[PDB]
Paper text:
pmcThe human macrophage migration inhibitory factor (MIF) superfamily, comprised of MIF and D-dopachrome tautomerase (DDT, also called MIF-2), is broadly and constitutively expressed with involvement in proinflammatory and host antimicrobial responses. MIF and MIF-2 are highly similar in structure, with monomeric units of 114 and 117 amino acids, respectively, that form homotrimers.
Crystal structures of MIF variants and substrate- or inhibitor-bound complexes typically display very few differences, and consistent with this trend, the P1G and S62A variants have RMSD values of 0.30 Å and 0.32 Å with the wt-MIF-2 trimer, respectively. Consistent with its modest effect on MIF-2 chemical shifts and enzymatic activity, S62A displays R1R2 parameters that deviate least from wt-MIF-2. While the inflammatory cellular response was modestly impacted by S62A administration, it did decrease alveolar–capillary leak in the murine model, when compared with wt-MIF2.
Residue numbers in the entry:
A (entry chain A), B (entry chain C), C (entry chain B): 1 to 117
Write the structure that this text describes.
């Protein structure tokens, strides 16, 4: 999984280690070993979410296999909202998630692609 | 809609409130209520556009329904180029846009997905 | 091509001119004119890669035509891994790549889309 979190919280208002705890949570939620999980956090950005510039965060989740249906993603969404609202001290209206299926031929690892690993 | 703007203009050379004006413009251009529009601006990056590191901006637009054909995207592109050239004091040659269709099952909102809202 | 590189290396640990050298390398590797190549570098981020927050980098490569098969991307991966490991002073285990095919109707340029140019 590849997670990318953009936020207009300044870095010093994002709890230390958030990227590590989100990595562990994503592994658990998505059913993947942590050594397959990736998290990128980009703080201090200028953002509007749902038309408003109050503190907010956007999460993108891309993965092989597990983020391709509405029913699967509904389940994931509830768990990721629970995690992020509490960590970031944000209301549920200040977070949105986008889900993106990936296939093995798209993922470059150790100088090849996952199709050949 | 989810708009993401990357620029090598330093933050202090990006007009104040650009994220608000781009949110309002995107609502009008794309035909969506502003409370459904999201904008993220990432300034101060190191960028080449068309092989050149002169000041530039990259805009990504992901939306349900309205960004899936060449004719639709041509219509949006004209308006977004007009808006961004004037805001950023950039020529049309220093801006590129990428359009990405989304579907409801990909959008996590209030702990579910838009398929069920 | 559109290349986007996220890294938790601080900006002052990313060698000067990396975006220029990556632009030139991408033109050669992907077989595209340099004036069609775009590169964005986002340093100083908070990142976990494969569950570890040691220095790392994530590269996304989006392009018309040339990043759509496992066999093409296997070759591109080897070349881009060779480039990024040496430029960033990172081991092969600290970089991943994602490949994203684009089509001409998705690329906004001079107020239209590339379908019409």
């Amino acid at each position: 999984p590849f997670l990318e979190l953009d936020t207009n919280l300044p870095a010093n208002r994002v709890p230390a280690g958030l990227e590590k705890r989100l990595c562990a949570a994503a592994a658990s939620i998505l059913g993947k070993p942590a050594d397959r999980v990736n998290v990128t956090v980009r703080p201090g950005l200028a953002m509007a979410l749902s038309g408003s510039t109050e503190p907010c965060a956007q999460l993108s989740i891309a993965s092989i296999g597990v983020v391709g249906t509405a029913e699967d993603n509904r389940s994931h969404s509830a768990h990721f909202f629970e995690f992020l609202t509490k960590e970031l001290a944000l209301g549920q209206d200040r977070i949105l998630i986008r889900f993106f299926p990936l296939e093995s031929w798209q993922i470059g690892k150790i100088g090849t692609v996952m199709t050949f690993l």
